[PDB]
Design an enzyme around this catalytic site. Structure first.
Site, PDB file in Angstrom:
ATOM      1  N   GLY A 129      32.963  56.020  68.031  1.00  0.00           N
ATOM      2  CA  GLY A 129      32.708  54.690  68.621  1.00  0.00           C
ATOM      3  C   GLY A 129      33.089  53.638  67.617  1.00  0.00           C
ATOM      4  CB  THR A 130      32.333  52.290  64.255  1.00  0.00           C
ATOM      5  OG1 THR A 130      32.567  51.403  63.391  1.00  0.00           O
ATOM      6  CG2 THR A 130      32.335  53.637  63.543  1.00  0.00           C
ATOM      7  CG  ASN A 168      40.402  67.248  63.841  1.00  0.00           C
ATOM      8  OD1 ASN A 168      41.359  66.456  63.487  1.00  0.00           O
ATOM      9  ND2 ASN A 168      39.520  66.784  64.103  1.00  0.00           N
ATOM     10  CD  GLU A 200      66.751  50.767  57.494  1.00  0.00           C
ATOM     11  OE1 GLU A 200      67.339  51.916  57.993  1.00  0.00           O
ATOM     12  OE2 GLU A 200      67.537  49.776  57.798  1.00  0.00           O
TER      13      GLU A 200
HETATM   14  N1  LIG Z   1      41.446  64.412  60.850  1.00  0.00           N
HETATM   15  C1  LIG Z   1      40.295  64.150  60.660  1.00  0.00           C
HETATM   16  N2  LIG Z   1      39.548  63.878  61.838  1.00  0.00           N
HETATM   17  C2  LIG Z   1      38.110  63.851  61.825  1.00  0.00           C
HETATM   18  C3  LIG Z   1      37.560  63.799  60.580  1.00  0.00           C
HETATM   19  N3  LIG Z   1      36.246  63.455  60.783  1.00  0.00           N
HETATM   20  C4  LIG Z   1      36.152  63.248  62.215  1.00  0.00           C
HETATM   21  N4  LIG Z   1      37.237  63.547  62.661  1.00  0.00           N
HETATM   22  C5  LIG Z   1      37.390  63.300  64.105  1.00  0.00           C
HETATM   23  O1  LIG Z   1      36.562  62.232  64.408  1.00  0.00           O
HETATM   24  C6  LIG Z   1      35.882  62.737  65.791  1.00  0.00           C
HETATM   25  C7  LIG Z   1      34.228  62.413  65.727  1.00  0.00           C
HETATM   26  O2  LIG Z   1      34.180  60.928  65.572  1.00  0.00           O
HETATM   27  P1  LIG Z   1      34.286  60.042  64.292  1.00  0.00           P
HETATM   28  O3  LIG Z   1      35.711  59.437  63.943  1.00  0.00           O
HETATM   29  O4  LIG Z   1      33.797  60.859  63.211  1.00  0.00           O
HETATM   30  O5  LIG Z   1      33.430  58.807  64.597  1.00  0.00           O
HETATM   31  P2  LIG Z   1      33.693  57.412  64.046  1.00  0.00           P
HETATM   32  O6  LIG Z   1      34.892  56.938  63.963  1.00  0.00           O
HETATM   33  O7  LIG Z   1      33.113  57.050  62.585  1.00  0.00           O
HETATM   34  O8  LIG Z   1      32.888  56.466  64.959  1.00  0.00           O
HETATM   35  P3  LIG Z   1      31.214  56.384  65.363  1.00  0.00           P
HETATM   36  O9  LIG Z   1      31.066  57.788  66.094  1.00  0.00           O
HETATM   37  O10 LIG Z   1      30.880  55.362  66.115  1.00  0.00           O
HETATM   38  O11 LIG Z   1      30.563  56.756  63.710  1.00  0.00           O
HETATM   39  C8  LIG Z   1      36.009  63.992  65.828  1.00  0.00           C
HETATM   40  O12 LIG Z   1      36.340  64.774  67.020  1.00  0.00           O
HETATM   41  C9  LIG Z   1      37.137  64.420  64.878  1.00  0.00           C
HETATM   42  O13 LIG Z   1      38.291  64.546  65.723  1.00  0.00           O
HETATM   43  C10 LIG Z   1      38.217  64.022  59.593  1.00  0.00           C
HETATM   44  O14 LIG Z   1      37.704  64.210  58.364  1.00  0.00           O
HETATM   45  N5  LIG Z   1      39.768  64.493  59.657  1.00  0.00           N
HETATM   46 MG   LIG Z   2      30.363  57.594  61.876  1.00  0.00          MG
END
Ligand SMILES: Nc1nc2c(ncn2[C@@H]2O[C@H](COP(=O)(O)OP(=O)(O)OP(=O)(O)O)[C@@H](O)[C@H]2O)c(=O)[nH]1
Ligand SMILES: [Mg+2]
Ligand SMILES: Nc1nc2c(ncn2[C@@H]2O[C@H](COP(=O)(O)OP(=O)(O)O)[C@@H](O)[C@H]2O)c(=O)[nH]1
Ligand SMILES: Nc1nc2c(ncn2[C@@H]2O[C@H](COP(=O)(O)OP(=O)(O)O)[C@@H](O)[C@H]2O)c(=O)[nH]1
Lengths: 291, 431, 426, 49, 429
Positions: free
Chosen positions: B136-137, B198, B246
């Protein structure tokens, strides 16, 4: 039929229990020394220690009546032969070893720590590992006899084998305190600091461990037998006591996944800085840092 | 000069930036304290007269646990008290809230920090945003921040590392909603976007690195490695130095065709590393095979349109040319007809450095690939079908409509993504 | 950030008592309120449940609510009864009489003024309140009426806050009250409008867990309250501790409720293992998934095999590799697609918190918006229809300020809710 | 050859990580036994009652 | 290549208990569950039968079943009983009453759901399941009636996995219960339908081996069960240990099942010798072949001479040369061609495992697809006809849900199997 090891154990139990060396042992003393929590059935969970005491009543009542409320080593040995015969039916692999273990556990015999009487869960010489190296123990003592302690005030950062044999019993895990009547003292709220544990082995020279006793322990509640060994870090430093090398065991239950991100960074950075300079003066051949 | 400002939006952005910054500090010899125990660090670390090097980044999450983790961890002395912004309440898997309600209350101070960083910099090459469009965020605040950056800094380059929802693994159910809604911002106000799903990285770790239990740490380390391989040309010397603009020009043929897939070689563990001769040809073939792809996008299913190679180590231009000629000769992959050259390659003498605590093996040479390919249409042609199942029965839409977003915004984003798929199919059409 | 807890009825009082016991055990807080924790991670988020005084004492943000003052002395005698503030103890002089109307219109209305005074005090003390956490039983009088009335006024005063409610649904087997369907229906129609997440627990399934899963011989209510407390801590573990991929009370909700009406969840906990099988079990994410989705492990007397899962959330705790949790959830869906709705893909959200509960390598709490939750509603509605066809026991409610057709509105609300559940089930 | 030399210390670090994880597994097994003991003590207590 | 073992009834529980004792001895596992083996090869392939816990407790993949809790009590009270997982003990309050109907429809059906839950738990947790290994007695009720339910449901759940069923076929001489014909007839038609290999055991042949080959004076059920446990280990020896010629359950099925219904096999184990004559014998491949093809060594009572061999499987254990082990089979074929079917060249498939059983320097198990397997079927079918014609003992079955119709179908299917065996016994090229 008891062989030599169990015969020696039962004789030692009878002798230690009969302090007068009269061969005449009281049933109340039998109840006092009967560590009923060591009953295999009680440990399994289908028996009560009080029921063990009452089956002891059943076993010894007629002989006590015959001998005026007292027991002879011959009948004690007969009881232990009956116990050994029953031990065959039980399901462990080594019946004999199970027999020595049961006899020692029941009659409080063996490598038993002198000050309080707590039997170690694991051998004293070996350094702690796992829960024995993470979970805090209970600081216990004996007051005239009742055993009294304070929960979670001792860090498991030291080997109990390095302590004098007259000081080991004051430190014991809840594993060890299980099944023992332990009065407890409420700790005193205070900041997170740790007292040392020092003892005198020669005139003017002392040995001990650094920061194992939590400051939540009330010094006034502590008996005079332990106040002489517990001391502050500044006092120990001024006193110049010798420190036994302890091991700092980090709690992994609170190891963040992100904590593993930065391990080895300092050493790798030192190596790469050496590589960078060695390239700069130009002694470096082959893999060269390019800026 | 040659600065590049990093942005870390959302939780995934925060951990990815954590791994990236740790790897950068190890590369440049900076302690976690911030002092080194050659102005090659100014591109990521702001030089200070005190001997410290404040990183040129902005951690930004509407929820405080990750930024407080950074404020607690080993990089307290490295990371500035500012540039580490904390929110009060998370968007909580809500694009509408992250971009509309609790995003406007923080984008102003975020832009203030961005202006401070830009003023500190003198030759800022561009912005490098890291986020996962699922969260979300992440999605909402990234969209809003990129809107502000596009309308403020003009035509400054903006490269985004986006963790799109994977074909089968997804940690959220409204994640298709967030993806389709953030696609509009990722297409118009994001100069380049990079898939970092992922499943592909998990499978790559379990195949090559031999990790039976991979986690986000390994994925973040691989992302840090590929980002470092991208920026090594502007951080260190090389035979063919390549800048952000580039490979921007050499990678983006049309203003809408900029979403790109990445791959890395040689991904291998230490135990299996010394049994193999990691030659330039071998690493190039490993890159071009779908096994080394960091995305669940098989390039065989489409046509390559533009390829960019970041070469690091002892790679010689003759071996580079031989490998690319062999790739041209190879049949299993085909290029688009109107782009005959199709290859950009930038060589660097700096070999990659393995982070202790990781699982990558140290290698004398490495290569990273950033590719525009027609096959990219499949990830979007999967996410839209993922979204339409929920949107048909209007599930979970009340959360998004109660946070200030019109129900027609869903349809507008879906139409934008449909047009994106349409012109991905159109660019690869034979002349 | 901060979560403020309210707990009504004797049932809710005991549930919250053991909840505060388990939270204080996890946060290293003794009954005297001092901190004895061995890690820094136990203090960084202490403000979620405990508020610090001038002297550093941590007092829970908890409100005790009951018409019977007798249970207050039992809480005093409780091991952790000294932890709460005295003014947060709103107790009536006259008993509830096991009467929802008595708890909702006559005495509840007259005590809820002070209840809201205390609640506003705690909310203003909170830096940024995340929501209210109310624990109650829907079969009693003061747990069911006063709790729902509090939910109503708190929803009116705070629109954006999350009213997470833990309601104890009665059972035909554990039927310990004849006005159980009266109370349950009069409470659920308040819940459906005033609660964001009304996740229920059932005593029959608690007994099932304690007899077959944990294999207790003579389990008192302490074991049941321990179960509900340990699964209650799991929704806020991600708030109180850092996580690799965490959530909060409504990051869970936004993924768990596809439609506003469908907000009743069924619960589950893992790992729950017996004394005999304690050592035979190898702790792993696979073994946690073996037990979350087990219908006979869930905390409700409504078998999930009879319905299809709309949405679910797995709040895992402990250091665990994310690939296995993702793979486990994905392949559970793939191999059991017949029990998952086809129009919402990947019905299960997975969140991970680093710090496991004290004494466990890894644990997990399960939130389930399964369509089979409507079985309890059918049972309650059938029992009401039987009792109301002849209009029995309603005079106690009617003489306490209840119009008859209010309840019929409540029953129509249940019928609409069950209609929605069945519509998405079939 | 220098890359191989550094890879060797990489492998030693990996082995150190593996033995640390083995110690962690031993601790978790002991924790399982501790839970066993706690349940057994509860059974003993209500058997006394 | 994990194998899940399921055990039914008193006979099945005791046979599987002694089998698990033997396997734990072979792989170095204590009753407490720890590994005290002295070799790496034990731990290399120990996942085939044991699953590791958190603390190194190696729990068998065994599902133990009986409608009477007394047998479960006995298995727990056994010396190796603490090895088994406590939750794998699935039992009922009331026994089967030696009634196939009660085992299959009334009491075993109300309990089969939890058994299938446990079987799924064990099977799908494995990396790649080889199959299932059920042990039971067809004469009994809960061993046969509900054991057949196991086979039926595990077929619907896992069509492609190997299924291996050890049924202790009752014999007229050692018939210690009367409804043996009914139970065996009702179980054989279920076994033949959906089992990859039904590998029969006979109590009277076990007794003959104990009395004459082993020269035991008062052999008990444990002495009887040791031999069948030995063959139970020998069949998966190649799975659990490396060898010069590896094999598996699917290899055995392929090389021993020319046609789907002919999967009822002969058992033989060598060496078997009394302790008095143990040191009098020059133990080698020739004597292994001698005893393996000897009629008295078979622990199912049906003379191979009266019939002809469809196929044979020689699962040899031991560090030995392979020219001799191949030439022995070749010579056996070449002279006893009258006992081997003409239209399968080299009826004998032989494989070699490098690790012999503990305490023995080489051994062999024999799996024989012969035409003499139908003599036991005929001798129990005659008893079934005698009891069925007079409607005797059928009220107990019909009062639980069955009828004459299913008995007639079981009879017809069993006679069809017997005719199929006889046709290839007297078949000509
Ligand atoms: N590559 C990578 N992807 C991650 C990681 N942690 C979370 N994700 C991705 O993020 C998704 C979950 O949403 P988040 O990005 O963690 O949530 P957010 O961007 O903080 O937004 P909010 O849910 O509102 O807090 C998962 O499906 C993962 O694919 C990480 O450490 N590395
Ligand atoms: Mg979060
Ligand atoms: N899980 C659990 N259920 C309880 C507890 N106490 C009571 N109950 C249930 O709640 C019902 C009675 O509710 P009650 O305590 O009278 O609620 P009140 O009248 O509002 O105070 C009974 O049917 C019990 O099953 C408890 O401590 N734990
Ligand atoms: N080989 C062997 N056969 C057994 C054993 N126990 C019982 N049997 C045979 O099984 C037959 C009776 O089976 P039964 O125990 O009634 O089967 P159940 O009802 O399923 O337990 C008898 O004829 C015995 O010969 C055993 O331990 N080993």
């Amino acid at each position: 039929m008891l062989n030599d090891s169990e015969h020696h154990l039962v004789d030692v139990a009878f002798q230690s229990m009969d302090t007068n060396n009269t061969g005449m042992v009281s049933l109340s003393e039998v109840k006092k020394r009967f560590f009923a929590h060591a009953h295999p059935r009680v440990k399994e969970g289908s028996m009560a220690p009080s029921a063990a005491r009452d089956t002891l009543d059943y076993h010894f009542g007629l002989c006590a009546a015959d001998h005026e409320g007292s027991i002879t080593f011959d009948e004690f040995l007969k009881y232990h032969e009956k116990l050994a015969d029953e031990a065959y039916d039980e399901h462990v692999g080594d019946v004999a070893a199970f027999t020595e273990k049961t006899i020692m556990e029941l009659w409080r015999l063996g490598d038993v720590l002198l000050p309080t009487g707590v039997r170690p869960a694991f051998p004293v010489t070996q350094k702690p590992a796992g829960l024995y190296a993470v979970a805090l123990m209970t600081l216990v003592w004996v007051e005239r006899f009742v055993l009294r302690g304070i929960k979670d005030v001792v860090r498991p950062i030291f080997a109990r084998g390095d302590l004098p044999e007259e000081l080991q019993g004051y430190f014991a895990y809840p594993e060890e305190l299980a099944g023992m009547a332990i009065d407890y003292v409420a700790p005193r709220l205070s900041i997170q600091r740790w007292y040392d544990f020092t003892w005198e082995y020669s005139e003017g020279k002392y040995c001990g461990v650094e920061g194992i006793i939590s400051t939540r322990v009330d010094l006034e509640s502590l008996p005079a037998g332990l106040r002489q060994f517990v001391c502050e870090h500044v006092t120990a430093v001024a006193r110049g006591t010798t420190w036994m090398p302890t091991t700092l065991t980090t709690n992994p239950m609170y190891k963040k996944t992100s904590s593993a991100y930065g391990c080895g960074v300092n050493e790798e950075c030192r190596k790469i800085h050496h590589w960078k300079v060695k390239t700069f003066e130009g002694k470096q051949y082959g893999n060269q840092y390019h800026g | 000069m040659r600065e590049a400002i990093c942005i870390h939006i959302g939780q995934a952005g925060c951990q990815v930036g954590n791994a990236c910054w740790e790897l950068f500090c190890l590369e440049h010899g900076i302690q976690p304290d911030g002092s080194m125990p050659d102005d090659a660090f100014n591109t990521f670390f702001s030089e200070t007269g005190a001997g410290k090097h404040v990183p040129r980044c902005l951690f930004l999450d509407l929820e405080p646990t990750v930024v407080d983790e950074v404020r607690t961890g080993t990089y307290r002395q490295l990371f500035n008290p500012e540039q580490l912004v904390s929110g009060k309440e998370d968007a909580a898997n809500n694009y509408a809230r992250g971009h509309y309600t609790i995003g406007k209350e923080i984008v102003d101070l975020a832009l203030d920090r961005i202006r401070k960083l830009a003023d500190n910099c003198t030759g800022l090459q561009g912005f490098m945003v890291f986020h996962a469009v699922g969260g979300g965020t992440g999605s909402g605040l990234g969209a809003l921040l990129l809107e502000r950056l596009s309308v403020d800094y003009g035509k400054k380059s903006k490269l985004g590392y986006t963790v799109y929802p994977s074909p089968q693994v997804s940690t959220a159910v409204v994640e298709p909603y967030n993806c389709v809604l953030s696609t509009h911002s990722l297409l118009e106000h994001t100069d380049v976007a990079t898939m970092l799903d992922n499943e592909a990285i998990y499978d790559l770790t379990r195949r090559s690195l031999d990790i039976e239990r991979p986690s986000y740490t390994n994925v973040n380390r691989l992302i840090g490695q590929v980002v470092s391989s991208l920026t090594a040309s502007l951080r260190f010397d090389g035979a063919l130095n390549v800048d952000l603009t580039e490979f921007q020009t050499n990678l983006v043929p049309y203003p809408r065709i900029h979403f790109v897939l990445t791959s890395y070689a040689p991904v291998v563990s230490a135990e299996k590393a010394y049994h193999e001769q990691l030659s330039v040809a071998d690493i190039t073939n490993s890159v071009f095979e779908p096994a080394g792809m960091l995305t669940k996008c098989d390039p065989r299913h489409g046509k390559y349109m533009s390829c960019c190679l970041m070469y690091r180590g002892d790679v010689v231009p003759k071996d580079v040319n031989a490998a690319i000629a062999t790739i041209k000769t190879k049949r299993t992959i085909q290029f688009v007809d109107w782009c005959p050259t199709g290859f950009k390659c930038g060589i660097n003498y700096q070999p990659p450095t393995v982070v202790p605590g990781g699982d990558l093996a140290k290698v004398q040479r490495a290569v990273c690939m950033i590719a525009n390919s027609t096959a990219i249409a499949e990830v979007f042609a999967r996410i839209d079908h993922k979204f339409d199942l929920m949107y048909s029965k209007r599930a979970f839409v009340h959360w998004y409509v109660g946070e200030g977003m019109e129900e027609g915004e869903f349809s507008e984003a879906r139409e934008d993504l449909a047009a994106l798929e349409k012109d991905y199919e159109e660019v690869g059409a034979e002349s | 950030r901060e979560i403020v807890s309210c707990q009504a009825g004797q049932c809710g009082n005991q549930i919250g008592s053991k909840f505060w016991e388990v939270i204080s055990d996890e946060h290293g807080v003794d009954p005297t309120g001092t901190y004895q924790g061995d890690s820094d991670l136990q203090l960084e988020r202490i403000n979620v449940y405990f508020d610090e005084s001038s002297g550093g004492r941590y007092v829970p943000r908890a409100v005790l609510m009951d018409l019977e003052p007798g249970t207050m002395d039992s809480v005093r005698a409780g091991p952790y009864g000294q932890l709460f503030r005295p003014d947060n103890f709103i107790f009536g002089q006259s008993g509830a009489g096991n009467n929802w109307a008595k708890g909702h219109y006559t005495e509840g209305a007259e005590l809820i003024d002070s209840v809201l005074d205390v609640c506003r005090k705690e909310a203003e003390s909170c830096d940024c309140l995340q929501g209210f956490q109310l624990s109650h039983s829907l079969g009693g009088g003061t747990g069911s009426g006063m709790g729902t009335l509090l939910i109503s006024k708190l929803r009116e005063e705070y629109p954006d806050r999350i009213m997470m409610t833990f309601s104890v649904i009665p059972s035909p087997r554990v039927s310990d009250t004849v006005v159980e369907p009266y109370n349950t229906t009069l409470s659920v129609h308040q819940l459906v409008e005033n609660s964001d997440e009304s996740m229920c627990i059932d005593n029959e399934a608690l007994y099932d867990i304690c007899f077959r899963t944990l294999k207790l011989t003579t389990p008192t209510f302490g074991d049941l309250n321990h179960l509900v407390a340990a699964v209650m801590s799991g929704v806020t573990c991600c708030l109180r501790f850092p996580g690799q991929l965490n959530s909060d009370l409504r990051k869970l909700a936004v993924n768990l409720v596809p439609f506003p009406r469908l907000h009743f969840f069924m619960m589950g906990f893992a790992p729950l293992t017996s004394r005999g099988s304690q050592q035979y079990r190898g702790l792993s994410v696979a073994e946690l998934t073996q037990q979350m989705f087990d219908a006979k492990n869930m905390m409700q007397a409504a078998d999930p095999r009879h319905g299809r899962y709309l949405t679910a959330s797995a709040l895992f705790r402990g250091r665990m590799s994310t690939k296995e949790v993702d793979e486990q959830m994905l392949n559970v869906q793939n191999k059991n697609s017949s029990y998952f709705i086809e129009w919402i893909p990947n019905n299960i959200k997975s969140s991970i918190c680093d710090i496991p509960p004290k004494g466990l390598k890894m644990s997990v709490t399960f939130i389930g918006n399964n369509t089979c939750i409507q079985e309890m509603f059918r049972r309650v509605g059938e029992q009401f229809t039987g009792m109301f066809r002849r209009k029995a026991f309603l005079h106690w409610y009617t003489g306490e300020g209840m119009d008859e057709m209010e309840f019929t509105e409540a029953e129509s609300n249940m019928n609409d809710l069950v209609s929605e559940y069945q519509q998405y089930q079939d | 050859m220098q890359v191989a030399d550094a890879r060797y210390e990489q492998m030693d670090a990996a082995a150190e990580r593996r033995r640390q994880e083995a110690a962690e597994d031993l601790l978790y097994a002991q924790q399982n036994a501790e839970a066993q003991r706690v349940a057994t003590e509860r059974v003993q207590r209500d058997l006394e009652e």
